Design a protein around this ligand. Structure first.
Ligand SMILES: COc1cc(/C=C/C(=O)O)ccc1O
Length: 255
């Protein structure tokens, strides 16, 4: 039963397995007044005659849109295999550059919230055949990106129903800011809150803090610790593997 460590080969490429296409895109950002990059995983069968859900996957501090793919995440391989095994239905995964910096901008990681919601999401929904409602939109990430997942996801429950912060960093908002209503909206609209981290990670306390608040305030969620895991992709890959399946079970790809 999930969550659990994935079996050997979950992140390996094997002959015959259908592979999705990872495309490179650039979109205009009203948040940075510049063109920004992102990568988009289209499943092996992506057809404009069908509709797909979308997972916005965020990298760590100083990272890039390539981190979750060739940079170590192998998100496309993990997705290809789960799809081939019938573990999850086909879906689209988008990896942006989380540091929306530029002239006139003080904090690019905070500025990223508007970039994602007002520029990247509209670009994706206009160029790809995707659902545009909260029930078909998820957000997850590692470290700094896990913090942004908590921050953006919980303060925008009308946009995301599935949130997966892995090894969330100190940029994670205080509990009072994540749940300004004592967790009311969360208990009603949150379909999946998946918090994971390696037991050896020095940043374990931040995800732990949110976990404790959710326990105290009756917010359902999944809290999974990777035994012996550190601040690396041997925690983040297993994290994504579990999140995709648990989100699927929760209805992310419904229809
Ligand atoms: C904003 O503060 C912090 C961010 C990080 C991010 C780490 C990562 O993305 O791997 C670590 C420690 C911090 O105090």
């Amino acid at each position: 039963s999930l969550p659990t460590m994935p079996p050997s080969g979950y992140d390996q490429v094997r002959n015959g397995v259908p592979r999705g296409q990872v495309v490179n895109i650039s979109y205009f950002s009203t948040a940075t007044n510049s063109t920004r990059p992102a990568r988009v995983y289209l499943p092996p069968g992506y057809s404009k005659d069908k509709k797909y859900s979308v997972l916005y996957l965020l990298h760590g501090i100083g990272g890039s849109e390539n981190d979750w793919f060739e940079g170590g995440g192998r998100a496309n391989v993990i997705a290809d295999n789960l799809i081939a095994e019938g573990k999850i239905k086909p879906l689209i995964i988008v990896t942006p550059n989380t540091n929306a910096a530029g002239p006139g901008i003080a904090d690019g990681y905070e500025n990223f919230t508007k970039d994602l919601l007002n520029s990247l999401i509209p670009y994706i929904e206009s160029n790809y055949s995707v659902y545009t409602d909260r029930e078909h939109r998820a957000i997850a990430g590692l470290a700094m990106g896990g913090g942004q997942s908590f921050n953006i996801g919980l303060t925008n429950l009308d946009k995301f129903a599935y949130i997966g912060p892995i090894s969330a960093a100190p940029n994670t908002y205080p509990n009072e800011r994540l749940f300004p209503d004592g967790g009311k909206a969360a208990r009603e609209k949150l379909k999946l809150l998946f918090i994971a981290c390696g037991t050896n990670d020095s940043l374990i306390g931040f995800g732990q803090r949110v976990h404790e608040y959710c326990v105290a305030n009756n917010i359902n969620h999944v809290y999974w610790l990777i035994q012996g895991g550190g601040h690396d992709f041997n925690v983040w890959k297993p994290g994504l593997w579990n999140f995709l399946q648990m989100a699927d079970e929760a209805g992310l790809t419904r229809d």
